[PDB]
């Protein structure tokens, strides 16, 4: 919509107060004109017809419980935008400042969030397994990273390339959580998962096996469920990325950690320069090695650490 850029205030899903960039034209809309060609948040009104209505508010105050998921979708979209721009010099997900659109209140008790090819979509959860999914910065950044992958490597969402596609989203979702720096960790979705249970999440990058996911290639899932295990076998790559960043000894193989910033550089470069739609795990290892070599040199610690991390998870 055409109007003036304004600044609203509200509460997110977890009760935290924050400012949001809005647009004024009769109503105050969730439209942030300060990043690229806009970040736009919509209300799906418990339906599944998308995108729904551009979120409109009478007073620019967003403190109703109904407002909370839209406050977070909008705000965390802006944080993720800032991360890709400031850290990777990437302008929005297509690299050309495409508008970022998100819809919240999708369906009823919908325990999930997803990129549909064109926009972000968040359920409210059923209140037991999930609260509104946009309350998790790692969930928002995970899903927006699928948009990034779709415009770059284009990793097919099945089998090994699919598990890489998932891992890449867990990695950058986690690096975005660290960038925002509020209670960061190496698990996925903990802020919005199971309000009655402390300390759990959907997945762990530091210990995939915590939730039944493989942490070594010899444990890969080779069946047909979950598109050949895209959310299962990502544990292998998640563990390798965790090792590259943090270090550790995993099945007897020692890895020297190089830190989060370098992990982010190596994997962003692999994603955007080397990976293709059909890349398998072994080809990811070669892309990450070639990335680390471009960035730090072939004799570098960074290159040696990438090789050790992939050895540790059984990927040759
Ligand atoms: Ca209001
Ligand atoms: Ca966290
Ligand atoms: Ca997390
Ligand atoms: Ca929980
Ligand atoms: Zn995903």
Experimental approach? X-ray
In a domain, residue 1? The reply is: no
> Does 129 count as an annotated binding residue?
no
Q: How far, in Å, is the centroid of ligand 5 from the Cα of 198?
A: 23
Considering the domain architecture, whether residues 159 and 286 belong to the same structural domain is answered as yes
Considering the domain architecture, whether residues 89 and 173 belong to the same structural domain is answered as no
- Contact criterion met (CB below 8 Å) for 220 and 233: yes
Considering the domain architecture, whether residues 27 and 107 belong to the same structural domain is answered as yes
Nearest-angstrom CA–CA distance, 157 and 21? 34
Nearest-angstrom CA–CA distance, 246 and 259? 6
- Contact criterion met (CB below 8 Å) for 236 and 284: no
CB atoms within 10 A of CB 111: 17
- Contact criterion met (CB below 8 Å) for 156 and 162: yes
Q: Give the number of whichever ligand sits closest to the CA of residue 192.
A: 4
Q: How far, in Å, is the centroid of ligand 3 from the Cα of 1?
A: 34
In a domain, residue 175? The reply is: yes
Domain around 58: 6-154
CB atoms within 10 A of CB 223: 8
Q: Find the CATH number of the domain harbouring 108.
A: 3.10.170.10
Total domains present in the chain: 2
Q: How far, in Å, is the centroid of ligand 1 from the Cα of 18?
A: 14
Angle of the 159-180 helix axis to the 137-151 helix axis, nearest 10: 130
> Does 61 count as an annotated binding residue?
yes
Q: How far, in Å, is the centroid of ligand 1 from the Cα of 173?
A: 30
Q: Find the CATH number of the domain harbouring 248.
A: 1.10.390.10
In a domain, residue 37? The reply is: yes
Place of tokens 């939730």: 211
Per-residue HEC secondary structure of the chain comes to CCCEEEEEEEECCCCCEEEEEEEEECEEECEECCCCCCEEEEECCCCCCCCCEECEECCCEECCHHHHHHHHHHHHHHHHHHHHHHHHCCCCCCCCCCCEEEEEEECCCCCCEEECCCCEEEECCCCCCECCHHHCHHHHHHHHHHHHHHHCCCCCCCHHHHHHHHHHHHHHHHHHHHHHCCCCCCEECCCCECCCCCCCCCEECCCHHHHCCCCCHHHCCCCCHHHHHCCCCHHHHHHHHHHHHHCEEECCEEECCCCHHHHHHHHHHHHHHHCCCCCCHHHHHHHHHHHHHHHHCCCCHHHHHHHHHHHHCCCC
**Taking phi first (over 0 means left), then psi (-120 to 50 degrees means alpha), and beta for anything else, what does residue 226 get?**
left
Residue ending a domain, among 92, 127, 154, is 154
Nearest-angstrom CA–CA distance, 213 and 30? 38
DSSP bridge pairs for 137: none
> Does 187 count as an annotated binding residue?
yes
Q: Give the number of whichever ligand sits closest to the CA of residue 146.
A: 5
In a domain, residue 199? The reply is: yes
Considering the domain architecture, whether residues 55 and 90 belong to the same structural domain is answered as yes
Residue ending a domain, among 154, 174, 204, is 154
Place of tokens 């729904």: 52
CB atoms within 10 A of CB 273: 13
- Contact criterion met (CB below 8 Å) for 268 and 247: no
In a domain, residue 186? The reply is: yes
Nearest-angstrom CA–CA distance, 237 and 284? 9
Considering the domain architecture, whether residues 120 and 198 belong to the same structural domain is answered as no
Evaluated on CA atoms 304, 315, 187, 175, the torsion sign reads: positive
Considering the domain architecture, whether residues 27 and 120 belong to the same structural domain is answered as yes
Considering the domain architecture, whether residues 159 and 80 belong to the same structural domain is answered as no
List, by residue number, the catalytic residues.
Answer: 143, 231
Q: How far, in Å, is the centroid of ligand 1 from the Cα of 57?
A: 5
Considering the domain architecture, whether residues 150 and 165 belong to the same structural domain is answered as no
Closest by CA position to 94, among listed 117, 112, 71, 78: 117
Considering the domain architecture, whether residues 135 and 183 belong to the same structural domain is answered as no
Considering the domain architecture, whether residues 150 and 162 belong to the same structural domain is answered as no
Spacing of C-alpha 26 from chain mean position: 34
In a domain, residue 210? The reply is: yes
Resolution in angstrom units: 2.2
- Contact criterion met (CB below 8 Å) for 103 and 52: yes
> Does 119 count as an annotated binding residue?
no
Q: Give the number of whichever ligand sits closest to the CA of residue 115.
A: 5
Considering the domain architecture, whether residues 220 and 114 belong to the same structural domain is answered as no
Q: How far, in Å, is the centroid of ligand 2 from the Cα of 183?
A: 4
> Does 301 count as an annotated binding residue?
no
Q: Give the number of whichever ligand sits closest to the CA of residue 55.
A: 1
> Does 215 count as an annotated binding residue?
no
Considering the domain architecture, whether residues 274 and 301 belong to the same structural domain is answered as yes
Q: How far, in Å, is the centroid of ligand 1 from the Cα of 56?
A: 9
Residue ending a domain, among 124, 154, 184, is 154
> Does 194 count as an annotated binding residue?
yes
| Cis preceding-peptide flag for 269 (omega within 30 of 0) | no
Distance linking the first and last C-alpha atoms of the chain: 52
Cα radius of gyration rounded to whole Å, the chain: 19
């Amino acid at each position: 919509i055409t109007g003036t850029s304004t600044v609203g205030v509200g509460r997110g899903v977890l009760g935290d107060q924050k400012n949001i960039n809005t647009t004024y034209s009769t109503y105050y809309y969730l439209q942030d004109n300060t990043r690229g060609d806009g970040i736009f948040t919509y209300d799906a009104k418990y339906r599944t017809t998308l995108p729904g209505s551009l979120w409109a508010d009478a007073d620019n105050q967003f403190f109703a419980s109904y407002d909370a998921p839209a406050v977070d979708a909008h705000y965390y979209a802006g944080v993720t935008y800032d991360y890709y721009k400031n850290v990777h010099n990437r302008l929005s997900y297509d690299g050309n400042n495409a508008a970022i659109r998100s819809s919240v209140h999708y369906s009823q008790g919908y325990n999930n969030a997803f990129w549909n090819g064109s926009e972000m979509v968040y359920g409210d959860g059923d209140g037991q397994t999930f609260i509104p999914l946009s309350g998790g910065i790692d969930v928002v950044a995970h899903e927006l990273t699928h948009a990034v992958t779709d415009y770059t490597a284009g990793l097919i969402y099945q089998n090994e390339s699919g598990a890489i596609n998932e891992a890449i989203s867990d990695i950058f979702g986690t690096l975005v959580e660290f960038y925002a720096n509020k209670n960061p960790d190496w698990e996925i979705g903990e802020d919005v998962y199971t309000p009655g249970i402390s300390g759990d999440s959907l997945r762990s990058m530091s210990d995939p096996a915590k939730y039944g996911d493989p942490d070594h290639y010899s444990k890969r899932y080779t069946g047909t469920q979950d598109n050949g295990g895209v959310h299962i076998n990502s544990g292998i790559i998640n563990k390798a990325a965790y090792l590259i960043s943090q270090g550790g000894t995993h099945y007897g193989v020692s890895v020297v950690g190089i830190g989060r910033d370098k992990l982010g550089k190596i994997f962003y470069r692999a994603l955007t320069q080397y990976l293709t739609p059909t890349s398998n795990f072994s080809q990811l290892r070669a892309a990450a090695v070639q990335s680390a070599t471009d960035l730090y040199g072939s004799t570098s610690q960074e290159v040696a650490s990438v090789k050790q991390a992939f050895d540790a998870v059984g990927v040759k």
